């Protein structure tokens, strides 16, 4: 997994030296986002149950032909299955913004993602309409401070630059 701690603890062992004082400087930088990033995790964990609907309804407005037959949204199960599908990606941004890295996403979300979408014919450009709608929705005065607006909005832009 990727984080601030486990990345810099690797090069201590993989070069065969002790814990330095430069890696001790690195966890100090994790303290400056510990009370600055984790407010967004408790934000969305009590907020997904209404935004799984409005961001699940966001893509079918762009792509009404998935309801159309012989397509990714040929039948209700993918969408009902389809709503469960999108509740795994930002289920991991609750796991990513609690750790400090993209660990729960680069090993559980993108690894093998383009290969189960070509074979099972799921159009990857509807996930770009699914959770990037929340990027165009986010209000820094009302919902949460601009520290989530620079970090929750960053981790989403990791994903659209991965499913494309």
């Amino acid at each position: 997994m990727k984080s601030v701690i486990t990345t810099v603890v690797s090069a201590a062992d993989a070069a065969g030296r002790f814990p330095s004082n430069s890696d001790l400087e690195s966890i100090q930088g994790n303290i400056q986002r510990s009370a600055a990033r984790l407010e967004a995790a408790e934000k969305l964990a009590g907020n997904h149950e209404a935004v799984v609907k409005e961001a699940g309804d966001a893509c079918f407005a762009k792509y009404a032909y998935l309801k159309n037959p012989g397509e990714a949204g040929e039948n209700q199960e993918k969408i009902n299955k389809c709503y469960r599908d999108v509740d795994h990606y930002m289920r991991l941004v609750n796991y990513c913004l609690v750790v400090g890295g993209t660990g729960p996403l680069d090993e559980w979300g993108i690894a093998g993602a383009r290969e189960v979408y070509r074979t099972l014919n799921l159009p990857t450009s509807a996930y770009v309409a699914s959770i990037a709608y929340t990027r165009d929705r986010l209000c820094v005065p009302r919902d949460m401070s601009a520290q989530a607006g620079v970090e929750f909005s960053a981790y989403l832009d990791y994903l659209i630059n991965a499913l494309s």
């Binding site: 559980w108 690894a111 093998g112 290969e115 189960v116």
Partner: protein, 177 residues
């Protein structure tokens, strides 16, 4: 490795004798449907996109707990490596079809899968449910009775071809038991 041409030469190495007009007639009939065997792998390579696809969905629509929390094919690191687990057994069976025997299959890949599968924790019980989904669609494309894709062949009987592909997949369950 060795073919059905060599399958009587498997026996002939331990004969202290030869193969002549005693056993060519079993190989002479293999040529008489040699057009047919090359005509009955042209259906199998014609639907490579769907055969590993609907197979792994054939167990999801029956046993859906394998993608539950506590699953073997939970995330995309696992199930994208499950479609590679299920495609290369469609690969070493089509090599065995043009050879007439499982000499390619039973030694290159299946030589002891119960030290790579029980060493991982792979569910063997619904692996064989993932086998007969492809076997029932292998005999269904040998005959032209697939309800979706009709294929234009020369007419004739292929029950010896349809029974042989079921007798390739049977020892797959034996290699995991």
């Amino acid at each position: 490795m060795l073919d059905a041409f060599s399958r009587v030469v498997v026996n002939s190495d331990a004969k202290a004798a030869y193969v002549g007009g005693s056993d060519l007639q079993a190989l002479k009939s293999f040529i008489a449907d040699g057009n047919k065997r090359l005509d009955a792998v042209n259906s199998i390579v014609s639907n490579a996109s769907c055969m590993v696809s609907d197979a792994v969905s054939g167990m999801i629509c029956e046993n859906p707990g394998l993608i539950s929390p506590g699953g073997n094919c939970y995330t995309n690191r696992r199930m994208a490596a499950c479609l590679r687990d299920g495609e290369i057994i469609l690969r070493y069976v089509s090599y065995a079809l043009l050879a007439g025997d499982a000499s390619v299959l039973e030694d290159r890949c299946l030589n002891g899968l119960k030290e790579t599968y029980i060493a991982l924790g792979v569910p063997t019980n619904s692996s064989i449910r993932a086998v007969s989904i492809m076997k029932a669609q292998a005999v269904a494309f040998i005959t032209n009775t697939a309800t979706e894709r009709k294929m234009s062949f020369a007419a004739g009987d292929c029950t010896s071809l349809a029974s042989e592909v079921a007798s390739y997949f049977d020892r797959v369950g034996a290699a995991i038991s």
